[PDB]
RNA sequence: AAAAAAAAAAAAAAA
């Protein structure tokens, strides 16, 4: 809709029945005209933000990865307030902004064509905010729309939404007051494939009042309830994708990309062909050894022989043969998993690594614990203090103080490297936040436990999913310090592989999709997998959930089976945890009163 | 004067008649003897500072610009107290120090020979300061003197002074108490060229008491008054330059450079000669293409044709040919401007680009506005708060708090680029300070309007002079918020092109030198010019002024005409501003009372 | 001792007689199993910390120095409280952690083989701390143990300890309460050579109550007392080294280096031989000529005429020949020093450079002074304020406030260079701390002088030991501001050169070891010497001491003579300082 | 410092 010469606008509607209706509006052609693409997004006439996307003129070939950057700029004037810092100006980004950056980055990054080496930057500025609303999902939609209008090698619009379960109804785009009445709230992002929605990213948590609401008669958020909630977000995503596509069509764009971006593949087909024809049988036979040192030595020897021969042949292309060898290895391993239920370390597909749990490991700490799962090793420490030491928050959003704080540390020696030790990175912030949300619904209230609580996790050893081990260590350490939890919490990380396998016969056209689910995946198994997801909770309901994938679709029964398998693993881990400690201890003599 | 063996000193006197007399003293040969040059400067034997200049041993020519660096170090013991921060130590430079750094950098950088690639660093430390004095103008002279003593390829001494207008007298080096009785305050820097002073830098503003002083019977600072102020500053500059030269002569120095610094010109003579002979007539006729896209297409076609022709001849020297082509293009465009008032975009000499102004653009802000001039687009937003939210300042200078704050942001997408989004750079600080000084003299007093005020400028699009559009946006947004200003303020950026060309006679050796003034210059037009300046004010008097040049001299009539042209331009802009809003609105329901 | 499967343990005992006994435990095999080496250390089962060492997979030859990094992580939960900053999280390292990093880095860095270019990182995390103890000396031992278990080209275990003098007894690992009753506090680190302890690093200071305790009957810490304190620390170091070696033996390790690390020497043997055989006699003759600028120009032309005739013989190896030429110059100069008592600037071995002192150089400052020694030039400024302006400290250690603050600045132009001006580096922090500790013992009490004091030193010109010059400048400025010091303090920096020399007999190969001590060394002389040390104090006792060395041993009489020479220089400097000012203004 | 031109397991020194 060309409201003005050169200005176009589009609208999407969110219908919640008796809970109200909301409108989302996209506008282009009036602000930031020198960017590659720019869009203004409105929610209900009082929420307003701007998104802009630009690309660099020339690529950076010497990089080995795609350089995408996302930035979120919160302005205090959006809340009608002057900043409280000493210099009265906005400084380094807050935790909320970093989490929003991660939420945008997770689904957009795999949507670009592989091999791209130009720099892409996306900047989102918050301009006006109603005191009872949240801006993050609107930001996801605006970033997608501006990138779509930028005319880049970018795959289709992406839609995002939040849904909260209230009295048996999944409400879309709820307010803070409404979220205060729900048992579960979930952020979901996806795209449209062949007229259907394919889910790409999920980030979900139980609310802080879930136990009291369930005692009052509400439904508890179990696995099937969460699956139904995933089903209820698809129409909203479809409406948002349609509005974005209409905006792109109205304002020209669509076809004629004009600017062409070169791509830099890791290896050429000619190099890959030689490596396959030379080392297929050797690699296939070598995997059956399964002896760690013997397996590694055989792999290294075959790699050295192949690289020597192909360096004699291709005359100075060593990285390409190295990449092709790894690709062939991964291709063989995936087929072996799908055919024989073979895992790289010899476990069955439902087996957990060796487990151990201990408490009281640090002499003068208020509480501490050590948790081990295979080569993953987490140390947790708890400290209690007076309630005035709660963190005071001066951000744009509605939060004003934080009674319970969780900090996560990942040093370089955890995997045996060297590196800088300094301020935490974005991934550390994300993992810490996910582990923090898993414990919040089970903490006691302030009136019955008047203390500030700080929890610290140290990843002393890493071989896959330290964030799920932080949950278990947090539970054990909090119980060791005398905090009266409502129920213990545990977590697990899971993977999924899938591909087309020909059934016993002929005609080579009866190949059908086949899926396999793996429990407690290794660090290397994540690269071979097709979907990753982490689940945490008590023995009665789920408290945190995270997911990201690339598949075009997933049958409902496959997802239900995977969720059930994760629940079984969680129960097994809770049984081991209970043997170390099963009730709160006495408070430490060193802690205050 | 050799007061001590190896120690020399020189004096300059500044006579203000009935307002007093002051002396500036330069000393060398005592402190910091391992630097290339070092000088100590005194003002009235209680203000004392040190300046030192050093150069790197080897050139580093993998850069394309001259690497000069200026640093100012404020020591809190110069005011006699311990720093108030948590660690009791001076940290990041304050705003005043950054502004002093830029005042030093602006005149000194073009005074070095072109092609230099050695790193040059200047450090100025403030050692002792009287409570009623300002140190910046003293620092300019010290920075010039220490560089002059270092035996570098540096063109002559530079003198700097501040003049303030009090009761019809222009007083040099005034105190803080004297500035409270003045209507105008100007900082001027220049050099000596054949017995006469050539002005190079100006930074000037109207004082905070100008309106009531003019109501009391003082003369308002109009354009002719400002020009008389520039005339009054020359004798002080001449005296300071003479003192510096005398000190340089007394301590040896003078000649005998000893160390020789290599230079790295952009292009050689042969390449320029070839490029000129190949394309002088092709470029001369190709400027007539009014169409922007057609113009640039023809330009790039000609450049590529020249590059392909000359690639084989010079074995591949593409940088030199690219530089020579641009040099020839600029040389021809300047001739077209001087001969027949040609402009690159087709405007006439006194034409402004298309203007637009609008208010009430951000839904929940206290006040907001959008201002557009050509491709320059500025968004301004106002916030009001309680008086306790004024900024508290802890610095060397006499200022202790700020009731009105202005912050200016320049994101990479405004030009279409990618880059870091972090703390603001020095140029952002400078532009914001200029725009703040433009609006200070018309604000209401605290007794009349008891609020703290924060103003933010976002440069959403930029093609030349965003700082002057910040002034218009600030006035519009402040009126939208309900602030009762005494008068609206507008600003404009101006250019000047000069050269001597053949007169309408014979011989081909008789040439007259002419000047052309351009209104509202583009970003590209700044590189074609010999002077650029900016003027802001009301319909009655000037409030801010900035000027940079490197011309040997400018006749009085030329400068008067340029200032009159700028006045007409800002009056035209004020008329357009008044249609959008001409009186204060009602204060927002969201603002406090 | 394998307490658990894969876990090994070892113990060391520190016996202080009637002052008590303490135990240190080392444990390995249970925490951080993916590092190259990791060790947990305990002191009396309430103090616990962890140390881990890792190495990079590939070298990096584009550097020209050995890249070693040391990090100390103080966790506030070790003290049982939440951090007080706005974000409630630990940020940049505090001054204490940086000084602990320096204490670890000083003795460990020269213990690696020459030419190593792999990156090496050591990280020490503080987990539990008793309120009356100090963790730094424990950290030294833990870092040594984890590096020794890592299987790297590392030269033997290193042991560190603190000893304090209380009522005539040197007590090892004293508590905070015990330090309040002592006159001197000293940190010492060393290693074992053929059954004996060789000292490598020393960092010592007098306490804040020394004057009052000496007035009450205690013995003042003179030079011989400090020398005896060095002897008293050796058995403790031996016991700690033994425990570390036992732990290394128990958990495998010991031999079998397995992974091999390439080395990158500055020059090859052939290049050095070619450079020496072409220029030895000529260079020695140039050294024998008594002239500074003449020898400078002669050497500069010799370098040009030697690089030019070997450029064809060695293909693009100019850096190798330059390094070999510099090494040969160093060897000849050291030989000349040991034989004829030669110094490059012509001074005698007990001579100080030209001195000058002046006060009241900054017009509005509360106190100010300018101090010059040779090309070293220091400016010092003092400011006084209300006692509420004292620094408030929130950290693991027992300190909570700081009445006297000293800040040291080292701008690039003091050498003639260009560089970044900004946050102070670790070396600036260390030098400032040494200068602050030298002056703390003579300050008046808060009761008789109720002010906060900030002292700033700025190295306007540097050619060797600005740290000791800042002590003199601070004394002068404090007196100029009116602070009633109990006594003035001065300092000096000293060097020592040692090597084997031919006897006056025969056989051509019968040699003896000789030592020579130099007063007030230049920056260039620090590279020639085998040991360097700095001493500061009053006319009656020592207040600060710092020492670094690599020698396998030092006879007692040689060290006593060196300390006496330093004391004589200190007295001369105090006499020059008394002329400028001899009482508070 | 002058100028429109982040993803992932992958400090030492006068210089
Ligand atoms: O912890 C982790 N991440 C976090 C978590 O909490 O989870 C903690 C911090 C944030 C999240 C983590 C994640 C990934 C890894 C990992 C390590 C190694 C390999 N790499 C191979 O694993 C391999 N590489 C080869 C090969 C290479 C070149 C040529 C030929 C072969 O072969 C093989 C073969 F499969 F055999 F083992 C993959 C992943 C470890 C830990
Ligand atoms: O917005 C601004 N804002 C600022 C303000 O406060 O003002 C904010 C902070 C300071 C600035 C700004 C915006 C753009 C510019 C700019 C200037 C020059 C060129 N350069 C060409 O533009 C060009 N390059 C060629 C050429 C190149 C290669 C070969 C041959 C020819 O030709 C040409 C031809 F002149 F014709 F147009 C571009 C942009 C400056 C300022
Ligand atoms: O100020 C200082 N302050 C510090 C302090 O102490 O607190 C502050 C914190 C720590 C230090 C300081 C100042 C200067 C130095 C320094 C040392 C060595 C050299 N280097 C030569 O000096 C040389 N280089 C050659 C040569 C070069 C090329 C080829 C052949 C020979 O020859 C020679 C020859 F020995 F003759 F003099 C220069 C400067 C050290 C410290």
Consecutive H or E run containing B97:
helix B95-108
C76-C81-C85-C88 Cα dihedral, nearest 10 degrees: 80
Q: Among candidates C370, C341, C321, which has minimal Cα distance to C475?
A: C370
Bridge-partner residues for B69, per DSSP?
Answer: B121
SS3 C456: strand
Strands B391-392 and A391-392: unpaired
Distances from the Cα of A277 to the Cα of A280, C488, C508, angstroms: 6, 85, 71
Rounded to an integer, what distance in angstroms lies between the CA atom of residue C30 and that of residue C52? 12
Two structure tokens written together for C164: 């304090």
Q: Give the number of whichever ligand sits closest to the CA of residue B469.
A: 2
Q: Give the number of whichever ligand sits closest to the CA of residue B412.
A: 2
A473-A478-A481-A484 Cα dihedral, nearest 10 degrees: -150
Distances from the Cα of B200 to the Cα of B158, B187, B192, B205, angstroms: 9, 11, 11, 17
Rounded to an integer, what distance in angstroms lies between the CA atom of residue B438 and that of residue B259? 46
Nearest to A46 among B364, B375, B452 (CB): B364
Q: Is A173 left (phi over 0), alpha (psi -120 to 50) or beta?
A: left
Per DSSP, which regions of B403-541 are E strands?
A: 404-409, 452-461, 490-502, 511-519, 531-537
Does the beta-carbon distance from B407 to A129 stay under 8 Å?
A: no
Question: CA triplet B439, B441, B445: central angle to 5 degrees?
Answer: 105
Q: Among candidates B284, B183, B294, which has minimal Cα distance to B228?
A: B183
Rounded to an integer, what distance in angstroms lies between the CA atom of residue C126 and that of residue A590? 18
Q: What is the DSSP letter of B153?
A: S
Cβ atoms of C403 and C390 within 8 Å: the answer is: yes
Of B318, B524, B528, the residue with max ligand 2 atoms within 8 A of its CB, to mutate for a pocket test, comes to: B524
Cβ atoms of C459 and C497 within 8 Å: the answer is: no
Q: How far is the CA of A328 from the centre of ligand 1 (A)?
A: 16
- Residue of C88, C132, C147 best to disrupt the A interface, most CBs of A under 10 A: C88
Cβ atoms of A337 and A516 within 8 Å: the answer is: yes
Distance spanning both ends of chain C, measured CA to CA: 66
User: Would you call C312 an interface residue with chain B, using a CB distance cutoff of 8 Å?
Assistant: no
- Please name the residue that has the structure tokens 């550097």: C63
Distance of CA C70 to the CA centre of its chain: 15
Q: Among candidates A469, A532, A521, A426, which has minimal Cα distance to A202?
A: A532
Q: Among candidates C40, C531, C456, which has minimal Cα distance to B82?
A: C456
Which nucleotide lies closest to C430 by the C1' atom and the CA atom?
D12
Cβ atoms of C55 and C66 within 8 Å: the answer is: no
Q: How far is the CA of C525 from the centre of ligand 3 (A)?
A: 8
Per DSSP, which regions of C466-528 are E strands?
A: 490-502, 511-519
Two structure tokens written together for B120: 């040059």
HSE-CB of C557 using CA atoms within 13 angstroms: 2
Length A355 CA → D13 C1' (Å): 49
Bridge-partner residues for C48, per DSSP?
Answer: C42, C128
User: Would you call A591 an interface residue with chain C, using a CB distance cutoff of 8 Å?
Assistant: yes
Does the beta-carbon distance from A454 to C129 stay under 8 Å?
A: no
Number of neighbouring beta carbons within 10 Å of residue B66 = 16
Please count the helices (runs of H) and the strands (runs of E) in chain B: 13, 21
- Residue of B418, B432, B457 best to disrupt the A interface, most CBs of A under 10 A: B418
A86 is near strand D: CB distance < 7 Å:
no
Q: Using CB atoms within 10 A of its CB, is residue A349 exposed (0-12), middle (13-18) or buried (19+)?
A: middle
Q: How far is the CA of C524 from the centre of ligand 3 (A)?
A: 4
Two structure tokens written together for A237: 């995503």
C303 is near strand D: CB distance < 7 Å:
no
Q: Among candidates A66, A64, A65, A24, which has minimal Cα distance to A46?
A: A24
Instruction: Sketch out chain B's domains with CATH numbers.
Output: 8-250 (3.30.230.70), 269-340 (1.10.10.400), 350-593 (3.30.230.70)
CB contacts of C128 in chain A (<8 Å) are: 362-365
Q: Please name the method used to determine this structure.
A: cryo-EM
Cβ atoms of C353 and B67 within 8 Å: the answer is: no
Of A462, A467, A536, the residue with max ligand 1 atoms within 8 A of its CB, to mutate for a pocket test, comes to: A462
Q: Among candidates C278, C460, C482, C276, which has minimal Cα distance to C368?
A: C482
Rounded to an integer, what distance in angstroms lies between the CA atom of residue B452 and that of residue B433? 18
Q: Residues with beta carbon inside 6 Å of ligand 3?
A: C 303, 322, 325-326, 329, 462-467, 523-524, 527
Two structure tokens written together for A516: 């396999």
Q: Kindly give, in sequence order, each residue whose CB lies less than 8 Å from that of residue C93, ignoring residues fewer than 6 positions away.
A: C72, C74, C101
Length B365 CA → D11 C1' (Å): 48
Rounded to an integer, what distance in angstroms lies between the CA atom of residue B320 and that of residue B324? 6
Rounded to an integer, what distance in angstroms lies between the CA atom of residue A121 and that of residue C292? 61
Consecutive H or E run containing C573:
helix C556-580
C178-C184-C187-C190 Cα dihedral, nearest 10 degrees: -120
DSSP A382-420: EEEE-GGGSEE--SSSS--EESEEEEEE--GGGTT----
Residues in binding site of A: 526, 532
Cβ atoms of B113 and B263 within 8 Å: the answer is: yes
Say what angle helices B426-439 and B95-108 make with each other, to 10 degrees: 100
Distance of CA B57 to the CA centre of its chain: 31
Residue C144: phi and psi, rounded to 5, are -60, -45
Distances from the Cα of C404 to the Cα of B341, C210, C436, C453, C459, angstroms: 70, 17, 8, 5, 20
Q: Which residue is nearest to nucleotide D1 (CA to C1')?
A: B69
A48 Cα to chain B: minimum distance (Å): 8
Q: Among candidates C166, C273, C291, C186, which has minimal Cα distance to C231?
A: C186
Number of neighbouring beta carbons within 10 Å of residue A334 = 17
Consecutive H or E run containing B440:
none
Q: Among candidates A140, A138, A173, which has minimal Cα distance to A157?
A: A140
Q: Resolution of this PDB entry, in A? A: 1.9
Which nucleotide lies closest to A105 by the C1' atom and the CA atom?
D7
- Please name the residue that has the structure tokens 């680009």: B353
A202-A207-A208-A210 Cα dihedral, nearest 10 degrees: -140
Q: Using CB atoms within 10 A of its CB, is residue B546 exposed (0-12), middle (13-18) or buried (19+)?
A: buried
A426 is near strand D: CB distance < 7 Å:
yes
Two structure tokens written together for A511: 């190949």
Chain D, protein-covered positions (CB within 7 A): 1-15
Q: Kindly give, in sequence order, each residue whose CB lies less than 8 Å from that of residue C382, ignoring residues fewer than 6 positions away.
A: B77, C365, C366, C367, C368, C453, C454, C455, C456, C474, C477, C478, C480, C481, C483
Number of neighbouring beta carbons within 10 Å of residue C533 = 20
Residue/partner pairs of C294-302 with CB below 8 Å, 24 or more apart: C299/C329
Residue C547: phi and psi, rounded to 5, are -150, 140
Strands B542-549 and B531-537: antiparallel
CB within 7 A of strand D (chain B, 528-567): none
Consecutive H or E run containing B37:
strand B37-43
Of C275, C304, C415, C464, the residue with max ligand 3 atoms within 8 A of its CB, to mutate for a pocket test, comes to: C464
Rounded to an integer, what distance in angstroms lies between the CA atom of residue C363 and that of residue B48? 8
- Residue of A85, A88, A126 best to disrupt the B interface, most CBs of B under 10 A: A88
């Amino acid at each position: 809709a060309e409201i003005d010469e050169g200005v176009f606008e589009t609208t999407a509607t969110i219908d919640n029945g008796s809970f109200g209706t909301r409108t989302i509006r996209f506008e282009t052609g009036r602000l930031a005209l020198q960017a590659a693409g720019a869009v203004v997004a409105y929610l209900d006439d009082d929420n307003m933000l701007l998104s802009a996307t630009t690309a660099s003129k020339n690529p950076k070939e010497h990089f080995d990865f795609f350089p995408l950057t996302v930035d979120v700029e919160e302005r205090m004037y959006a809340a009608g307030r002057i900043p409280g810092s000493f210099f009265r100006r906005e400084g380094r980004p807050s935790t909320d902004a970093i989490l929003t950056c991660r939420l945008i980055d997770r689904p957009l990054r795999p949507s670009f064509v592989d091999g791209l080496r130009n720099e892409i930057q996306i900047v989102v500025t918050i301009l006006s905010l109603d005191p009872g609303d949240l801006y993050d999902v609107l930001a996801i939609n605006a970033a997608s729309a501006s990138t779509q209008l930028g005319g880049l090698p970018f795959s289709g619009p992406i839609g995002g939404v939040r849904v909260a379960l209230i009295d048996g109804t999944w409400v879309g785009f709820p307010t803070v007051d409404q979220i205060e009445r729900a048992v579960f709230d979930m952020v979901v992002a996806g795209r449209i494939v062949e007229g259907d929605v394919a889910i790409m990213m999920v980030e979900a948590e139980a609310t802080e009042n879930v136990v009291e609401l369930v005692e009052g008669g509400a439904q508890a958020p179990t696995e099937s309830v969460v699956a139904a909630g995933l089903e209820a977000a698809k129409p909203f995503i479809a409406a948002l994708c349609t509005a974005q596509q209409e905006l792109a069509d109205a304002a020209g764009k669509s076809g004629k990309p004009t600017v062409d971006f070169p791509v830099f593949p890791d290896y050429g087909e000619d190099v890959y062909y030689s490596v396959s024809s030379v080392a297929t049988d050797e690699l296939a036979a070598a995997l059956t050894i399964g002896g760690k040192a013997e397996r590694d030595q055989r792999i290294d020897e075959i790699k050295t022989q192949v690289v020597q021969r192909l360096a004699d042949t291709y005359e100075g292309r060593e990285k390409e043969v190295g990449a092709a060898f790894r690709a062939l290895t991964k291709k063989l391993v995936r087929q072996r998993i799908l055919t024989d239920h073979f895992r790289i370390d010899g476990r069955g597909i439902t087996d957990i690594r060796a487990l151990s749990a201990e408490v009281a490991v640090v002499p003068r700490a208020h509480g501490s614990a050590l948790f081990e799962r295979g080569e993953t090793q987490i140390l947790g420490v708890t400290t209690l203090d007076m309630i005035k030491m709660a963190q005071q928050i001066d951000s744009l959003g509605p939060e004003t103080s934080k009674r319970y704080m969780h900090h996560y540390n990942f040093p370089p020696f955890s995997t045996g490297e060297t590196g800088r030790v300094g301020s935490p990175k974005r991934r550390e912030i994300g993992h810490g936040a996910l582990a923090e949300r898993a414990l919040v619904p089970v903490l006691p209230s302030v009136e019955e436990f008047p203390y500030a609580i700080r929890q610290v996790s140290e990843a002393l050893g890493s071989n896959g999913s330290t964030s799920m081990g932080s949950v278990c260590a947090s539970t054990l350490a909090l119980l060791n310090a005398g905090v009266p939890l409502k129920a213990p919490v545990a977590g697990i990380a899971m993977g999924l592989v899938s591909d087309d396998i020909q059934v016993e016969g002929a005609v080579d056209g009866v190949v059908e999709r086949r899926f396999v689910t793996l429990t407690d995946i290794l660090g290397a198994e994540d690269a071979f997998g097709d979907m990753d997801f982490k689940v945490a909770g008590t023995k009665d309901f789920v408290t945190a959930l995270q997911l990201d994938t690339k598949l075009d679709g997933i049958p409902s029964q496959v997802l239900a089976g995977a969720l059930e398998q994760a629940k079984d693993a969680r129960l097994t881990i809770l049984e081991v945890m209970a043997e170390a400690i099963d009730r709160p201890d006495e408070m430490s003599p060193y802690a205050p009163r």
